[PDB]
């Protein structure tokens, strides 16, 4: 259940970046292919660049999230580099929410 | 059976003999009028049965039909009704009536003339025309027969409304 | 007191509605809509509720507070054209 | 407000050095006499509260 279950966190998330706008958003995607990130500052915005693979390629779920949490925690974070951020947390918390956010402050960001 | 007239107001619409009139043909709105002599040739014998002309003041020639019937509420001075004219690509309202005619084979057990008091039928008609040819009221009023609305001698094609199952004539003497 | 049938002799009761801020009028944190005496925050009365609507208003100053869950509060960022400062 | 063991309850806490009766009730569904608790008093932290008279 996703395109029927996934509805809990959407507008309820954006209520701290739009009720304060002092924290960033966060994409977060399953796929289990690649990893990426792609965030945008303030709820009134939704456009920014990113990157891709061409780094270390060997698919995974656990140890692959914490990576970009620092491997690409500034490569795209041009504007300000870091400026009070908040995580998405769409679904549960398998560990991709941990090993990412717990490897987020690893390189950058002030959460 | 001519036309002319114009008045964009309910002035000559409430002055002895006249009407009000409505038109919305393809690029042809306005509100005409016309007198009211033999202006009750609707539900008589012309109920969509056939379609002559009119020769309006100036241009064109639109046949059209009658667009149901209406007369007048309570009295008998038909306040303004309506008038369809075949020149549109989606309105509704069809005039397919269902009468009552004959000696009434009701004196079999107990029952009088085919009643019916409604003024609405399960009908549909695609374009806009409403032919004139249908019965339904007869067919040995007794039991193990009946004859209402659901299919019958139906204009031309099929039907479309909502739920095909009104009541209309029926039997039940 | 004491009562019975075939007669009755009971009172009746209401309260003060008192809407207050009257639409396009300055702003500040007045009140408006005592549909619910407890009330709640609002910031900036957009005019919400079920179905499409929201009060054509736009007029920044301060917070707002309004109605109940019945219609809707506001809290919108936007003055009216203003956005920079004051 | 009535009196005579039937309906209503008349209990009201007790806390050492945390002067306050809690001043609220419920009912005798739960045990009588005894009445374990916890919860904040004057302020500070939580204090005694064990109920008695």
């Amino acid at each position: 259940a996703t395109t029927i279950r996934r509805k809990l966190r959407t507008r309820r998330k954006v209520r701290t970046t739009t009720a304060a706008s002092g924290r960033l958003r966060l994409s977060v995607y399953r796929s289990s292919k690649h990893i990426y990130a792609q965030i945008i500052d303030d709820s009134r915005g939704q456009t920014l660049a990113a990157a891709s693979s061409a780094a270390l390629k060997s698919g995974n779920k656990t140890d692959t999230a914490a990576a970009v949490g620092k491997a690409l925690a500034a490569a795209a974070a041009e504007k300000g580099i870091k400026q009070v951020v908040f995580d998405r947390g769409s679904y549960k918390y398998h560990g991709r929410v941990k090993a990412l956010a717990d490897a987020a402050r690893e390189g950058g960001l002030d959460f | 059976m001519e036309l002319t007239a114009k008045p964009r107001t309910p002035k000559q619409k409430l002055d002895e003999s006249m009407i009000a009139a409505v038109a919305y043909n393809k690029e042809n709105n306005v509100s005409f009028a016309l007198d009211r002599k033999a202006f009750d040739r609707a539900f008589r014998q012309q109920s969509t049965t056939g379609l002559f002309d009119i020769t309006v003041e100036g241009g064109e020639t639109f046949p059209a039909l009658v667009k149901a019937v209406q007369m007048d509420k309570r009295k008998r001075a038909p306040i303004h009704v309506d008038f369809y004219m075949v020149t549109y690509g989606e309105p509704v309202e069809v005039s397919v009536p269902v009468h009552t005619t004959g000696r009434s084979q009701g004196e079999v057990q107990g029952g009088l003339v085919d009643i019916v008091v409604h003024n609405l039928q399960i009908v549909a008609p695609g374009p806009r025309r409403i032919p004139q040819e249908l019965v339904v009221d007869v067919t040995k009023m007794n039991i193990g027969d009946h004859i209402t609305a659901g299919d019958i001698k139906l204009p031309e094609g099929c039907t479309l409304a909502a739920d095909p199952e009104l009541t209309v004539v029926s039997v039940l003497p | 007191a004491h009562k019975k049938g075939v007669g009755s002799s009971k009172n009746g009761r209401d309260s003060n509605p008192k809407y207050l801020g009257v639409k396009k009028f300055g702003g500040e944190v007045v009140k408006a809509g005592n549909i619910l005496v407890r009330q709640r925050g609002t910031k900036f009365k957009a005019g919400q509720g079920v179905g499409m609507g929201r009060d054509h208003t736009l007029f920044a100053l301060s917070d707002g507070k309004v109605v109940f869950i019945n219609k809707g509060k506001g809290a919108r960022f936007i003055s009216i054209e203003a956005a920079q400062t004051e | 407000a009535k009196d005579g063991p039937r309906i209503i309850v008349k209990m009201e806490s007790s806390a050492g050095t945390g002067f306050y009766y809690t001043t609220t009730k419920n009912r005798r569904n739960t045990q009588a006499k005894l009445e374990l608790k916890k919860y904040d008093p004057v302020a500070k932290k939580h204090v005694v509260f064990r109920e008695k008279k």
Partner: protein, 124 residues
């Protein structure tokens, strides 16, 4: 013979209404909310059935609205009591429409009987 209870109430006001329909045979309509005493319309069909026939059924388009509350008369200087009157009130709706022939409107001839006001028959 209308409601069975569901509390009293109702108020007044006259004009016309809305309940006219293109009849199939020989209509008949009211013309404003005239006078019918309920216990008048309680003598509307039977009077329209002295002996029209052994059997026979047609159609009407109305139904008893009513209550009024009249109260005694020992000293009218009070509130109320209860209905104890009853009335229909209508517009220009259909109520008869024969389906026979030679008879035409024989029972729409002594319909005007219990009718202090004007109630034509028309036709459709």
């Amino acid at each position: 013979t209308k409601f069975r209870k569901q509390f009293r109430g109702r108020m007044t006001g006259d004009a016309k209404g809305g309940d006219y329909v293109a009849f199939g045979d020989y209509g008949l309509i009211a013309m404003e909310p005239a006078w019918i005493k309920s216990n008048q319309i309680e003598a509307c069909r039977i009077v329209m059935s002295r002996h029209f026939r052994r059997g026979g059924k047609i159609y009407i388009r109305i139904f008893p609205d009513k209550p009024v509350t009249k109260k005694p008369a020992e000293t009218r200087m009070g509130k109320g009591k209860g209905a104890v009157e009853y009335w229909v009130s209508v517009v220009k709706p259909g109520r008869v429409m024969f389906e026979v022939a030679g008879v035409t409107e024989e029972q729409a001839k002594e319909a005007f009987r219990l009718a202090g006001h004007k109630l034509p028959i028309q036709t459709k």
